Amino acid sequence: MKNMPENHNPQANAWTAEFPPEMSYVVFAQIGIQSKSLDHAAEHLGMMKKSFDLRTGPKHVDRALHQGADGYQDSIFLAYWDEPATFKSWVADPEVQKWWSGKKIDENSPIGYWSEVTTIPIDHFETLHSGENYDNGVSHFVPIKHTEVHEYWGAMRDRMPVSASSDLESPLGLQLPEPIVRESFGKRLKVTAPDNICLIRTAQNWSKCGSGERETYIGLVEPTLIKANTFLRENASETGCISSKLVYEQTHDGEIVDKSCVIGYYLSMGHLERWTHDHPTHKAIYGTFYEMLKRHDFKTELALWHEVSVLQSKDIELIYVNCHPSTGFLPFFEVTEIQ
Ligand code: HEM
Ligand SMILES: C[C@@H](/C=N\O)c1cccc(Br)c1
């Protein structure tokens, strides 16, 4: 609450996850099939989707489609557990072992496999929701409550309990190295990340918007989001953004719905903060959002939310099997070949 302004009174309501006392960790797993034609991914996606309904399966799973550059796509599962023990039991199930860690991927395969598994201690985790919505990531299975801790720069950091006792800076300092090009196709590679990287899933949901509000979101706001994500992807060193994906969410048979999110990793929470507060790209987003609020009497059916975590090296398992060299963390930090 260090950054809360004096006489703080927010002009809009917001909600935040309230984790139960017995809950110590969230496991958030991003599992992806990389392809040039979705046809080639279809077999792998069926096997994975049947795995999620095991009794040890995730409390919640989203599906999303990422358009990468060079014409590669990632078909992604976003899966949540509230017990690390249960997630370990899921991975050990033989149904999961049939495909886990890219086991079904060939040396000359047309598809790649990747997984980014982050085990998030609850005191390094915070969410924010623009409405009392129980279909926003962990709000599918965790209660949410009203909070006044928003609507100022620094509110995100204040909502994360550990920021009261840690600056959450990176051991590598302020300068993320330039991305390097590694020979990743044909190989099973593991990346080891530094401590205190910051992960954000920030989401947009215009599915309940009226016709006119939807027109405004798609015509005015979404283009600035697309531009922001492209900037982030192309300017890693300047921003401290290790990886940024704009993805469109899907029904579980693959139909794209009116929902998206950006999933980004940053060298520290401070890099995310400085980009959000100072860079023109997020300012244009905030501007067009406010313009959208003025047009509809400041009462929107657009749902916004995010989940932000700060991660230790040992809590991030990053695996890339036959993937494009720009996928995820592949351009950064320490890589090890697995065999
Ligand atoms: C690349 C995509 C995005 C990133 C990385 C991002 C990042 C962030 C972060 C980190 C904050 C919290 C800053 C703090 O509390 O100190 C924030 C706040 C905010 N963002 Fe974004 N954002 C993105 C997209 C969007 C979109 C699409 C919208 C609206 C359509 C939006 C509107 C806002 C608003 C209104 C706030 C203030 C929230 C509050 O505290 O009440 N952002 N953003
Ligand atoms: C989730 C965040 C945006 N980006 O992380 C946001 C945006 C608008 C209103 C609220 Br309330 C929260």
UniProtKB/Swiss-Prot annotation:
One of its GO terms (molecular function) is phenylacetaldoxime dehydratase activity. InterPro entries: OXD. Its cofactor is heme b. It holds the Pfam family Dehydratase_hem. It comes from the Bacteria. Optimum temperature is 30 degrees Celsius. Keywords: Heme, Iron, Lyase, Metal-binding. Its EC number is 4.8.1.4. Optimum pH is 7.0. Belongs to the heme-containing dehydratase family. Monomer. Catalyzes the stoichiometric dehydration of Z-phenylacetaldoxime to phenylacetonitrile. Prefers the Z-form of phenylacetaldoxime over its E-isomer. This is Phenylacetaldoxime dehydratase. The lineage of its organism: Bacteria, Bacillati, Bacillota, Bacilli, Bacillales. The gene is oxd.
